[PDB]
Design a protein around this ligand. Structure first.
Ligand SMILES: *Cc1ccc(S(=O)(=O)N2CCNC(=O)C2)cc1
Ligand SMILES: *Cc1ccc(S(=O)(=O)N2CCNC(=O)C2)cc1
Ligand SMILES: [Cl-]
Ligand SMILES: [Cl-]
Lengths: 9, 228, 228, 9
């Protein structure tokens, strides 16, 4: 299950 | 730590640290910028979130590797080192939560900023819940749930169903239900309703907004495919 | 920092840190193990080298990103942040060099260990040379060259031409000639002679040793293809 | 030009 990666602006 | 550096210089250096893949530095620059006391712009909020998501993401990945080795082993070394990584992770989550509580959330009045910060609060309590054991787990789980629920309530009143923050909030709250709260049916329901309501609003969007919303919709669909 | 932890526990935790991709922790565990004062086994020397190569490799990649942005820009922020990363990188190289000088090299009598540590010494002076400017550059370059040359002289007397450490030493010394010493013809010569002399000794090897040596030979060939 | 990666035990 994936959350928002959220790791790149 | 960053009290002597200008706000604008901290923001500039956070952007350079992202380019250099120096995420601990990025997070320390953005902590320093928050501690200047001014509200954050949209771009600055995203820098803060990217920095900490990368820091805590590496910690979580390491904790999962160590926890897997520890479970298979069941000397003190694996447990001791898993505990060290766990404490570091908890410290980063507590730092982010402390920035949100002092004073980003209370000063956030527009829906876009308040939802963004409440989603962050839900996320970092969720990361605490991932490593929590017992009744501590219960209160931490409820803190994540309460932050996500307040963000949801605002988002549904104030944002269109395609708004990317509204979509990412719903995605992450559905993961919370599936992975933390042992509520897979609530996770599936939320992901399906969110996807369907976004689909029906795509016609209102520009080409660029369409691309932003459909990217997150595909993440919802990817979870629904894994869960059903 | 690690004075109260048992040597064997530091080594155990360095292996866990590698699995978790926690290379700063890995390097701190292996520094603590070196500082116990005993010589390192072959496997322990490799843990020390892997840990620091990963730490300094991330610093070098960040320094190159920042140096590129700084050169294109030619406020103080890009230079200040490149300088901060540069100082951190220098500090890590000085720490490794200090472990080698106190007292890994002087206690290393077998050719395998002495060559390994002298190659490390050449490598970390080479990383210092990458960021050095001016006459500082000259003495640092000569320190790299002298360490690599002593390692080469021992390796050619004491190891077969297929030995992986001998091969990796020659590879990295050829990169030194090409990238640092402005001696591309010496780089090409060394890589070609090293490759050819290894090829002629492959017939002596087991299947597993053949695989180890040919992997590094291909790196020599890859550089020769780029340089010719 | 590549040196030994040297980043995996
Ligand atoms: C939590 C979350 C929600 C949406 C995104 S994004 O759509 O990838 N985007 C990041 C850049 N600026 C934005 O406003 C949204 C990321 C995370
Ligand atoms: C510098 C260097 C030379 C050779 C190697 S390796 O052949 O990949 N190997 C690492 C594992 N144990 C060894 O003895 C050699 C790496 C680096
Ligand atoms: Cl406000
Ligand atoms: Cl000895």
């Amino acid at each position: 299950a994936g959350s928002i990666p959220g790791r790149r602006s | 730590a960053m009290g002597s550096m200008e706000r604008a210089s901290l923001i500039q250096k956070a952007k350079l640290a992202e380019q250099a893949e120096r995420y601990e530095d990025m997070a320390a620059f953005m902590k320093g910028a928050v501690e200047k006391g001014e509200e954050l712009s949209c771009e600055e909020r995203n820098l803060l979130s990217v920095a900490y998501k990368n820091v805590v993401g590496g910690q979580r990945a390491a904790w999962r590797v160590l926890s897997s080795i520890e479970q298979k082993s069941n000397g003190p070394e694996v447990r001791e080192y898993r505990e060290k990584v766990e404490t570091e992770l908890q410290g980063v989550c507590d730092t982010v939560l402390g920035l949100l509580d002092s004073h980003l959330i209370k000063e956030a009045g527009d829906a876009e900023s308040r939802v963004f910060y409440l989603k962050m609060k839900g996320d970092y309590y969720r990361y605490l819940a991932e490593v929590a054991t017992g009744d501590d787990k219960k209160r931490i789980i409820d803190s994540a749930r309460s932050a996500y629920q307040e963000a949801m309530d605002i988002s549904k009143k104030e944002m269109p169903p395609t708004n990317p923050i509204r979509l990412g909030l719903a995605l992450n709250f559905s993961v919370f239900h599936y992975e933390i709260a042992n509520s897979p049916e609530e996770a599936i329901s939320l992901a399906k309703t969110t996807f369907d309501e976004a689909m029906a609003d795509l016609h209102t969007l520009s080409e660029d907004s369409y691309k932003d919303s459909t990217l997150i919709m595909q993440l919802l669909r990817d979870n629904l495919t894994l869960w059903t």
